[PDB]
Amino acid sequence: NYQPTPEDRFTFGLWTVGWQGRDPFGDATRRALDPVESVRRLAELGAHGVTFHDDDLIPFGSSDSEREEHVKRFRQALDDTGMKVPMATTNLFTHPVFKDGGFTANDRDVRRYALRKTIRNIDLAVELGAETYVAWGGREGAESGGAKDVRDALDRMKEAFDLLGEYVTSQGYDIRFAIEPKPNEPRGDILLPTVGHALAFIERLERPELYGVNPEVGHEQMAGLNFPHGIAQALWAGKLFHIDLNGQNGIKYDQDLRFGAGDLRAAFWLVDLLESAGYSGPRHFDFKPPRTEDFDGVWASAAGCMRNYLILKERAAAFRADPEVQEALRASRLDELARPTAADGLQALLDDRSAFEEFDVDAAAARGMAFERLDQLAMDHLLGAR
Amino acid sequence: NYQPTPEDRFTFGLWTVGWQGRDPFGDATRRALDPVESVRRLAELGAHGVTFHDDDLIPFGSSDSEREEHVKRFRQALDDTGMKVPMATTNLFTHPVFKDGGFTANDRDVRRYALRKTIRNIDLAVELGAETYVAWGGREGAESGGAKDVRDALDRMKEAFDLLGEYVTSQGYDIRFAIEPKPNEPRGDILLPTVGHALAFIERLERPELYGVNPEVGHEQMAGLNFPHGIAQALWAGKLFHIDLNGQNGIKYDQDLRFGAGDLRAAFWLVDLLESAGYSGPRHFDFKPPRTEDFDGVWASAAGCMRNYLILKERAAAFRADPEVQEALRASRLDELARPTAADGLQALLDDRSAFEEFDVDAAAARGMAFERLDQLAMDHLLGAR
Amino acid sequence: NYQPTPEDRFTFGLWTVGWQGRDPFGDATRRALDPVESVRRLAELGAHGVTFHDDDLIPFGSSDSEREEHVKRFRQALDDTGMKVPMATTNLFTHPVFKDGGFTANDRDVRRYALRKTIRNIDLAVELGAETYVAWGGREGAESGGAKDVRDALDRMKEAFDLLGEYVTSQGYDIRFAIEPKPNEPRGDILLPTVGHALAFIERLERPELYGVNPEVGHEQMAGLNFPHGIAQALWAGKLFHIDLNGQNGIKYDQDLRFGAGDLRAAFWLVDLLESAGYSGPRHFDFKPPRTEDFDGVWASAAGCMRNYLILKERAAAFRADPEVQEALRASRLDELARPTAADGLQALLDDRSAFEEFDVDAAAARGMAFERLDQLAMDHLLGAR
Amino acid sequence: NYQPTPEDRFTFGLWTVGWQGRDPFGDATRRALDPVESVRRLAELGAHGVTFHDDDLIPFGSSDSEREEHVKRFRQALDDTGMKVPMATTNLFTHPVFKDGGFTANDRDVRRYALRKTIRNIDLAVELGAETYVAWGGREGAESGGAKDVRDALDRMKEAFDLLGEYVTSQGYDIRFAIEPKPNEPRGDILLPTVGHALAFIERLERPELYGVNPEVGHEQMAGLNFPHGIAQALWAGKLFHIDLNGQNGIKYDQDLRFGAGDLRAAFWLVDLLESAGYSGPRHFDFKPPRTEDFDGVWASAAGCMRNYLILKERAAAFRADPEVQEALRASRLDELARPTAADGLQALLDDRSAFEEFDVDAAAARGMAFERLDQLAMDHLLGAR
Ligand SMILES: [Mn+2]
Ligand SMILES: [Mn+2]
Ligand SMILES: [Mn+2]
Ligand SMILES: [Mn+2]
Ligand SMILES: [Mn+2]
Ligand SMILES: [Mn+2]
Ligand SMILES: [Mn+2]
Ligand SMILES: [Mn+2]
């Protein structure tokens, strides 16, 4: 019955089920949750673990005595439940000091502070066993053209990531970084707005092997992009270090719906790709239970994330294993797409009259791709109408 | 009076002013143009040169005798006018054989043909003096999830670009490649949909130094992205090999309006950045005169592209040179954004109590960025209201 | 097995399966179809009937002898198959004369011609038994601000529709009009861009009872709008005279995918609403088989439209009939939403201290809406995971 | 120098300059403002007046003694400055009780309360001299399909507006209502999402003459719609009771930038239309100074709204008065667009062989519209490049 177990590796941010429902036009609709109670509540649902921002575990401005007791209580809930902490991250967006950014703030002292805050939490992340450290530069960007020279800001962004990579190397940590793109909100435009921009930026770091992406379903969809396509490119690059799952109904504010909501067909093709590719990291949900809900609806929504992943996994596997689909894939030439165009090499291609001079372009053009039958088989599988 | 001269390097595709106005719901509204007459007509307007697809110079399926006479006539118009041909490209989208792509077609024979067609035109491009060879993979992509394994397709795309780079190296040509991203249309989703995705892909080629981007204003805006930001990232990467200028009114079909139309403020900030950065390549217009127009309106629209570039150039230069704006930039800390965050190095940063333990975050947060005054100075400059 | 029969009332435009695959960057990939063969082919698939533009039945500029033989051949295919023609429409977009519009062309003679062309086809539509006459003003609009005074254009649009309503009244026809909104493409902005704008405009006609809407799934989604919501408003207004079904993957060019493709969840909620409301008109598909397909894929895609409608109909009915869902609807107060707010009347409301002075807003606010559990039941039903 | 005076009728919501900068990912960056100080500060800038939500003048849950003193202090600032209060509105979105809506909440008691809260503030609005009472139903809508039957919700919405119209009639007030559309945010989809949907809904009210629209620039642009077009339709309907001015950079979260920011060309065409139409209501700014700013930047941003309106007013007037533009308008047939298509009547049109049988469609089609020259004259005027 699509019941999750910890071996499914489902994880959740403390800030997700813990979202109090404050939006830019409304006050909180739910009380804050003790992280201890979310660990317990999630473990009961079948989750594998939790993630946190530094401020989602230890309230900003804590004395070290308080910090110690916050951590201690959290550590006991993990031990009580068997939950893990595979990823953590820094809040560089909530406090007003970060109103123009953390790593790319125009104010140099803020940039320095953002790094000092980030490094403190990396140490804590390692202590709690995280393998991935995410950065979402939600305040990096601008509302107006003169406010941000983006060439200078990317210099400042490279600087920061290079320093964090020097730091983890100096400490001998095994943790790796994952940049989480978003195209806008809360800034008018955010730097590194998509998976492609983040991938490209990483290739300009001193130690590129230490940084990957953490793409979020709804964020690429906020640019009207195909999320499964961007995940394929991240996988092709060897850079899918982590993944954020949720739903989004098109180009609008970041909704962070429960996974499977939003674009259901894209959710199907995403799961198909993650499972085909053997992605083995956490299946992490970054989602807000809608503020219409009380705490029972919070946990229902969380359960739904996991349930929908496992239904889509079953339907995609059944699609890929159906001999009628395999035949259709053959009919649509997907096997040909995986064979080299010219393993025979450039000269042989140049000398191959069958590639140009005697190529029958009209017979090739007349050959239908048969993609609509293939896609209606995929639809039939998704809906259990086979 | 904002009169262009060839030294402004303005160029135009033959397919732009030559667009007959056929759209997906309407027939042609203008006759086809002889490329000779467009070269002459553009030179009279002050353009520096023209670009072409192979099929926009030599009709598909020409005998070599016909090909020779087409080229000869074009060459004479160039010589008659002093016009140049700085860029050329391949039509891998119009013919039905390319209905599932050229380089990433599922059919291997089509992929081979696409390369054979591309290489033939590279030789011609070199003969006519082009320094940049553009690729727009407008048919590379899918309408449905099962039709295109994107991992395999990027393998096929890398293959193709690697082969074209082996070819130009083997011939000793100096020409370089520029990939032109577009997120969708005519395919439901197009591969390498944005500047970031193209930049990232190039870093996976055998000879990355040979490939840059040719970003188009309207295409990044079709993903709701900030075009000046993406140009800054391309410039930061050292990869702005060429630029396509036009206008776009938001997220919708590719309009290819005359430059300055669409998002006027973004046009201002683009020109500001190109001129600040000392971009020295062609200012190339990829635009469709609307099909409401007759041939006089075609040439009016072309003239307008150039005029609007030169007005925005003047207003941006005046903005950057105004001592009141310089002071505002200082007030908004843009100078600080250009200074290293931590040239003193990681350890010094770690030991700097002013970066954390004794950082006054409340006083930093209280400091306004003054970006609205800066932006109203930019507005006043753009509108000539100073 | 979700097999359609004519009693399902599925209809298709001749221009849908007959689309030759010409897009704004590519030539045709399929030959044209004889309307006779599409009637036969669709009847074999289980369709109820077909619709046409005047130019999709009789080629533009036909002699009346030719027109007669075209009609005669079509009439025989209808009789041979039992197919019906419930709707027809005018092509006021393909010919270059309509480059600035038909009814709102700036040129008065074109406006007159557009009406003369429209009235000729209304007579033919009546002869073939249509009950609905659609208008899609795809060329009505502008690319630039000065080109179209929209106040004057709406005067010209009202004029035209008023004249067509006088005409059908004068002839004693029973046919009714349906305006099909689209927000853009082929014009930069199209007038009456959404269901709401069309509904509002109709209330300004001389005979409002004669005009409704024909909303198309993909067009409202091209404005990022909720198609089921707009259909509910059209139904609430008593104005859903006809409906166009297809799919659309977000805000981009009009894709006209096969129904069920695009936004699958929205397709579910649409079918739920049409069936709940007892909509009894044609279930009309306005769709393009992708130009990757040959004619077998054309018919596969058409079959898929019908299949997906019938699967979604079954799943929605099962949702609405499930006692667990009924209970959830009760828990989410949907029954309360259908009860008058204040049947007791204004004064009683004013005097009801329970409505303000003694209203417990905190207890009301604390009551969760339970919408996430309700929606996961809807998801479970859609996917057959109950 | 584009200095505003109260006769320009510029108004501002207390919540605009008073926005503390709390966004869905960040805390406040500015303290709250005393409404008294905003009235004074705005009057010094040249504003005509202010508007308020009930909760933006009197903190929620005030004793009547407190309410009295809040009002008294506000009244004295108005008298001290000569500022007016032309519009007011109800906060039916911030308090958690309104998490599923006010007038269309599923909970009947909340719907009753929303009306009781609305009516209390209408009385206060009248006392302070407002002529327009706005409703923005920002919580009316849904995130999921089953949560909201939209047919029932529109019944509940009609009910509420009908009751408020009975109330103001019963009291003999002269105030009129204006519905402010928004397509989404904070709900996933908001009911009456555009100007067209609101216009259409009003025609279903018992007393339609009492309700108009208050369209907001950024909200229609959040649906990718042309704001000047929707204003023209509202003006054509006689329903532009009020207007909200700001800027928006495309399809994304509601930015509420200072007017003239966002889409500058659309701002030009809007002002052109308001001034051409002789719109005489308040020019009301609904805008957020970005949270990067301190209070000096708040007032700079407010000043900028007014400045940009007055620059665009000058440039549009100069466009409309330029004899070269008048000639171009004549060349593009805008005069013809304003002449009836068929004042000669239906029969005369039917009998006019020049309208069909002898219409030269090819010569008509060959006539260019000359819209690009017209639009480059508009551009030259906007930029002061004539
Ligand atoms: Mn998100
Ligand atoms: Mn995330
Ligand atoms: Mn383009
Ligand atoms: Mn281009
Ligand atoms: Mn369509
Ligand atoms: Mn349609
Ligand atoms: Mn707004
Ligand atoms: Mn507003």
Residue numbers in the entry:
A (entry chain A), B (entry chain A), C (entry chain A), D (entry chain A): 2 to 387
Mind quoting what the paper says about this structure?
To show that the procedures described in this paper are also valid for macromolecular structures, we grew non-merohedrally twinned crystals of two benchmark protein structures: cubic insulin and glucose isomerase (Sevvana, 2006). The complications of data collection using these twinned protein crystals were similar to the small-molecule examples. Automatic cell determination failed, but both RLATT and CELL_NOW clearly identified two domains in the case of insulin and three domains for glucose isomerase, and their orientation matrices were used in SAINT in the same way as for the small molecules. TWINABS produced detwinned HKLF 4 data and several HKLF 5 data sets. Both substructures were solved using dual-space recycling methods in SHELXD. PDB2INS was used to convert the .pdb file to a SHELX.ins file. Both the insulin and glucose isomerase models were refined using SHELXL by alternating with model building in real space using Coot.
The active form of glucose isomerase consists of 385 amino acids with eight methionines, a magnesium ion and a manganese ion at the active site. Glucose isomerase (Hampton Research; catalogue No. HR7-102) was dialysed against 5 mM Tris–HCl buffer pH 7.5, 10 mM MnCl2, 5 mM MgCl2 and then concentrated to a final concentration of 20 mg ml−1 and crystallized by the hanging-drop vapour-diffusion method by equilibration against a reservoir consisting of 0.05 mM Tris–HCl buffer pH 7.5, 0.1 M MnCl2, 14% MPD. The crystals grew in about two days. In contrast to the interpenetrant twinned crystals of bovine insulin, here it appears that three separate crystals grew in contact with each other [Fig. 11(b), right]. The detwinned data extended to a resolution of 1.6 Å and were truncated to 2.0 Å resolution for substructure solution of the two Mn sites in SHELXD. One site has a much lower peak height, which was interpreted as a mixture of Mn and Mg. Density modification and autotracing of the inverted substructure in SHELXE identified 352 residues in ten chains. The second Mn site was partly occupied by Mg. The occupancy of the Mg atom refined to 0.64 (6).
